[PDB]
Amino acid sequence: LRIIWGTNVSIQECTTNFRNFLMSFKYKFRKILDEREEFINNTTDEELYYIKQLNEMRELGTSNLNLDARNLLAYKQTEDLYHQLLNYPQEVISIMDQTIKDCMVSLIVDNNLDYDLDEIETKFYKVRPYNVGSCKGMRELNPNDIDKLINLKGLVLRSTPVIPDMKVAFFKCNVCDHTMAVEIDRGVIQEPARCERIDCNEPNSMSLIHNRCSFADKQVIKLQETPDFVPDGQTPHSISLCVYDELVDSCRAGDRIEVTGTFRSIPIRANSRQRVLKSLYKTYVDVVHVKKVRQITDQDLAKIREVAAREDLYSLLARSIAPSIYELEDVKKGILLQLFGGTNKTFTKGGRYRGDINILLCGDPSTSKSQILQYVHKITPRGVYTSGKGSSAVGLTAYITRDVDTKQLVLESGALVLSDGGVCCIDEFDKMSDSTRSVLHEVMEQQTISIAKAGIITTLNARSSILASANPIGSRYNPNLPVTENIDLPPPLLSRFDLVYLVLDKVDEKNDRELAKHLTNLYLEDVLPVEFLTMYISYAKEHIHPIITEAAKTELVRAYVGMRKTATTRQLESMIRLAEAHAKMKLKNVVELEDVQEAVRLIRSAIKD
């Protein structure tokens, strides 16, 4: 009957229409609405999409809804709310929450169970509508749609810390020490005039207790117009976004998001002291829904086990990591062994012993090493792909820098620290400067980086693995001259790499034809897992820790001695790491003869080059 002042929305019909919508709607009505042909009605027409989500939310206890606009328009009688929400979002959403308040009761007592409902009474619910209408950029927003729901798209530039907002004031009397709480409306606090206590009753005896009030959380986000839609010779524009309650700390910096929210405009004061305002408002949006652009199940465990039970797991993931790369199976073997890494240990007396494998690729200038590095970048969980051509001498480690937004101090870690526990890929290793090289030296020796600047003395943790690619001086790597002259790298730096591979390119009719054939076949338009590798890698790296047995002793000692029939002691610690990394593959819990045989074969084929 009665209508909220100003608008035309009435609660009475809206509540009834919404309950009819929820208990009545199914995928049947949705597929009748869209009816785009080839629409599946296989038992979906009776699934009761809303009621099942309602029940699963009740049993979970979480309050999150994804009501859509097209689905809201689907029902004939509730079509009024579709055009009644775009123009008055706040009141319709207030009705929304009020109806969801008893949507719980409508289903908890259908069978008269023993749910408490008291925690339901205390907790509150809300909605997150999306796909309200056609998406329009910030470059087309008039004052004609203020306080109306819109959908925007843009790049996230920055976020601000949590902002307190007062809800309930708290005043204490300095004479009688009486406490009373005053609600605030739209920001303004209505001051208490005199103490309510009739006996006390003193004028001007009020004191505000700042830390005894009640506060809520706010966040402000900054967006930028996407470069695709901008026209020629223009500068991108910006919009500020208000985020409240559960949605705070959701949008990371640099992401691109599409949001739904209410456009709004407020005045800003001309003079700081005076009451005066200037005749030009500022425009922003209050957001209600945000969209962007571990915990493996038991079935995943079973499929991992059965795949691990394969006869030849080595070759399959040898070919999977680099589908495009043809031949070069040996370097892929080495990279597959590197991605697991030997076990890591730190006993009290001896100290920490390294368990990371370092690989250097070098050779003729027009092979495919860069694509190989960009392949291994994606597979590994946490890693960084940055070239060593330039940048700061401590660009891979901590660099104390002045903050840009605030005139303060921030400690920013580098790329080696940010690749902790993973594989760090370095490109153009030969162009890295003589002064920054020493930094890597402390990374590959002690696995820690120390910074002592601006009154800060501290140490970080590197614990990463280095895969690097380099280029020689000239157009070919002539085998006659030894490695040292061509690669332009210090002998210790080359020596400390666990595996060094030489990629050669010789004019061979068979090889040239075979390469060109599959290259053209790839350009011609006509056994590789997609994400199994990442989960298998995580499982092997986070749960599995092999050990060594005397069977490895017998082979390892005699193999090292036979290699000593100019193999430094580094060689044996390289064989142990490779053998223990192979043991982590073909899932096991202990090393045997096969692992040490594969490791020695790999390290001697490396010697052959």
Partner: protein
């Protein structure tokens, strides 16, 4: 009338020329000096798939000698270097950009470098090619930094925030 004007347009704008109040700070020093502005009321800018363009391509096909004539008409002032003019045409068009599965990508863009002794019409040829395609930028030496200026800081005077 809002949004009728965009940066980089030569236009003839009509309106009322009015004095701004110049109040607030720094008004006292001026005393009787005022700003000014123009309230705009009219705009006169000085300067697709349809059957017309469907027939233009057919006419040019019936003309014949498309390759040689297209190369030749590029900068008719400069006499010679006809093979260079053939190659600039291939640079104007673009090769296939095919997105191969599993992450592989192949480029179709053209990289053409023109070396040679000074005083051979080096730097008219280039400028002239910029006219043909609307999406093009002529970047020069260290006088300005635009090739690698992918900066994340912009001290715009209007608001003093980064862009």
């Amino acid at each position: 009338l809002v949004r009728s004007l965009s940066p980089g347009d030569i236009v003839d704008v009509t309106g009322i020329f009015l004095p701004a109040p110049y109040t607030g700070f720094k008004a006292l020093k001026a005393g009787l000096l005022t700003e000014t502005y123009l309230e705009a009321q009219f705009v006169r800018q000085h300067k697709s798939l349809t059957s017309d363009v469907e027939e233009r391509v057919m006419e040019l096909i019936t003309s014949g000698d498309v390759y040689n004539r297209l190369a030749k008409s590029i900068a008719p002032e400069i006499y010679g270097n006809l093979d260079v003019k053939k190659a600039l045409l291939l640079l104007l068009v673009g090769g296939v950009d095919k997105r191969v599965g599993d992450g592989m990508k192949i480029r179709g863009d053209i990289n053409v470098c023109l070396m040679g002794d000074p005083g051979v019409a080096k730097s008219q040829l280039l400028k002239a090619i910029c006219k043909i395609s609307p999406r093009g930028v002529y970047t020069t030496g260290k006088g300005s930094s635009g090739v690698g200026l992918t900066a994340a800081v912009m001290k715009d005077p209007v608001t003093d925030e980064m862009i």
